[PDB]
Amino acid sequence: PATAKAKKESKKQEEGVVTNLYKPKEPYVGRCLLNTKITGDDAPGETWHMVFSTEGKIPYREGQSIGVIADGVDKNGKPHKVRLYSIASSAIGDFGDSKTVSLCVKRLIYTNDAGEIVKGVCSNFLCDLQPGDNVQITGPVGKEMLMPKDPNATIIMLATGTGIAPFRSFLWKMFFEKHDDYKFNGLGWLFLGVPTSSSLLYKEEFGKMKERAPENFRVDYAVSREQTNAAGERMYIQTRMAEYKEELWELLKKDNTYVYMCGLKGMEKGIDDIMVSLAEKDGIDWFDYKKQLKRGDQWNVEVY
Ligand SMILES: Cc1cc2nc3c(=O)[nH]c(=O)nc-3n(C[C@H](O)[C@H](O)[C@H](O)COP(=O)(O)OP(=O)(O)OC[C@H]3O[C@@H](n4cnc5c(N)ncnc54)[C@H](O)[C@@H]3O)c2cc1C
C-alpha cells in the first residue's frame, strides 16, 4: 500500500510484543502454584520447574524473559537486584489458560577453594518457593529470542543446561498447541547439552513431541560425562553437532533457516570452532559469515 512504513521489518514475530510493563519500582506480585525438582537425585546441580499465577496481566511471548526480585534486603537495607530468567512456558502456559508463567531454575551452589559453601541469592530463593508463596516479577524482557514469522522455517535450537527454557516455550507452541493463525510445518531441530542423563530436562516432553511430529522435529542430546565420539572425546554440544556438520552447514546456506543459541556463556566458542573449519571448506570466513546471518536474524544468541 501507498502507506508510510519508515521502520525496519524483522523476520521475527515482533507484532504485539511488549517489554517492561512491570519495573523494579512496582513489580507484579504473582503466586507460586507449583514447584518441582526435575533433575535426578544424582544430578550435580539440581534444577526446578515452577509455575506462577499472573492473572494474565503479563502478556509475554515465546522467547522472552521475566525478572525476579528475591525477598530480603542487602547490607544497605536495599532490595535485591533483578535477576532475569527465560520463560520456559508457551504464551498459553502449562495450564493452557494464558494465566501463568513457568521458569526452569538451576540452584546456584558451589564451594570456593576455602571449602566454604556459597549460594546464589535469587536462584536459591526461587527453588525454595512453596506453593502459595508470593513472588515479585518484572518485565517481560527481550526481543532477541523471538520466534520467526515463517511457519515453515527451519529452526535450529542449540542449548546447554537451563538454556533449554526458551526452546521448551517454542516447542510447546509448535507441537503441543492448536493455533488457527500459526500452523508449524517446517523443521525443528534441537541440540541439548548437559553433563549427566539425570540432568536431561523435559526429556519426556520432547519424546512425546517426536511421537506426534516425527518428520517436523529432531532431537539430539549431548551428555558430556557419559558419551564420547569415535575419537574418544567427551560429547559436548559442538561434538554432537560435528556428527551432522555436513547437514548443518548446508542448512545454514538456506534463507529460511534460523539458529537460536541459549545457555552457558562459552558454549559459543566451541560452536564457532566447528564452524570455522566448515567455513574454510568453501573459502569462507566464518566470522564475516556469522555477521551476515545476524543481520538477517538467522543467528540469535542469549548466553549467560
Ligand atoms: C537473559 C538471561 C536469561 C537467564 N535465564 C536463566 C534460566 O532460564 N534459568 C537459570 O537458572 N538462570 C538463568 N539466568 C541466570 C540468572 O539470571 C542468574 O544469573 C542465576 O540464577 C544466578 O543468580 P543468583 O541470584 O542465584 O546468584 P548470585 O548471588 O547473583 O551470584 C552469582 C555469583 O556467582 C558466580 N557464578 C555464577 N554461576 C556460577 C557457577 N555455575 N559456579 C560458580 N560461580 C558461579 C557469578 O560470577 C557471581 O559472582 C539468565 C540470565 C540472563 C541474563
CATH of the domain at 289: 3.40.50.80
Please indicate, yes or no, whether residues 34 and 146 belong to a single structural domain of this protein.
Answer: no
Residue 302 lies in a domain: yes
Is 103:54 a contact under the CB 8 Å cutoff?
A: no
Determined by which method? X-ray
126 lines ligand 1 (CB under 6 A): no
Identify the CATH number of the domain in which residue 29 sits.
2.40.30.10
SS3 state at 159: strand
Q: Is the dihedral of CA 284, 285, 288, 294 positive or negative?
A: positive
> Dihedrals φ, ψ of 250, to 5°?
-65, -40
Angstrom distances, CA of residue 256 to CA of 106, 148, 269:
33, 9, 24
104 and 229 inside one domain? no
Which candidate, 197, 244, 258, places its Cα nearest to that of 11?
258
Residues 25 and 174 in one domain: no
With CA atoms as reference, report the closest residue to 70 among 13, 112, 129, 113: 129
Q: Are residues 300 and 154 in the same domain?
A: yes
User: CA-based angle 153:210:11, to the nearest 5?
Assistant: 15
Give the active site residue among 22, 28, 60, 85.
85
Alpha helices (H) along the chain: 121-127, 165-171, 203-212, 237-241, 245-252, 267-279, 286-295
Best of 38, 103, 116, 304 for a ligand 1 pocket test (most atoms within 8 Å of beta carbon): 304
- 260 as an active site residue: the answer is no
* Domain range for 259: 142-304
- The verdict on 295 and 157 lying in the same domain is yes
User: How far apart, in whole angstroms, are the C-alpha atoms of residue 242 and residue 66?
Assistant: 34
d(CA 41, CA 143): 35
- Ligand 1 mean position, distance from CA 186 (Å): 33
Per DSSP, what are the bridge partners of residue 193? 160, 222
Active site residue 302: yes
Distance between CA atoms of residues 158 and 190, nearest Å: 6
Ligand 1 center from residue 107 Cα (angstroms): 9
Give residue for cell 538477517.
296
Nearest CA to ligand 1 atom 35: 120
* 1 lies in some domain: no
Tell me, yes or no, whether 292 and 302 share the same domain: yes
Residues 167 and 268 both lie in one domain:
yes
Q: Does ligand 1 have an atom closer than 6 angstroms to the CB of 120?
A: yes
Separation of alpha carbons 239 and 286, rounded Å: 18
Same domain (yes/no): 48, 153: no
Confirm whether residue 102 is marked as ligand binding: no
Which of 22, 46, 62, 86 is an active site residue? 86
Domain count, the chain: 2
Question: Is the CB of residue 132 less than 8 Å from the CB of residue 34?
Answer: no
Contact 66, 87 (CB under 8 A): yes
Provide the edge-to-edge strand list for the sheet that holds 187-194.
217-223, 187-194, 154-160, 257-263, 299-303
User: CA-CA distance, 298 to 290, in Å (whole number)?
Assistant: 9
Find out whether 106 is annotated in a ligand binding site.
Answer: yes
- Contact 45 CB / ligand 1 (< 6 Å): no
Question: Cα(85)–Cα(302) distance, rounded to whole angstroms?
Answer: 11
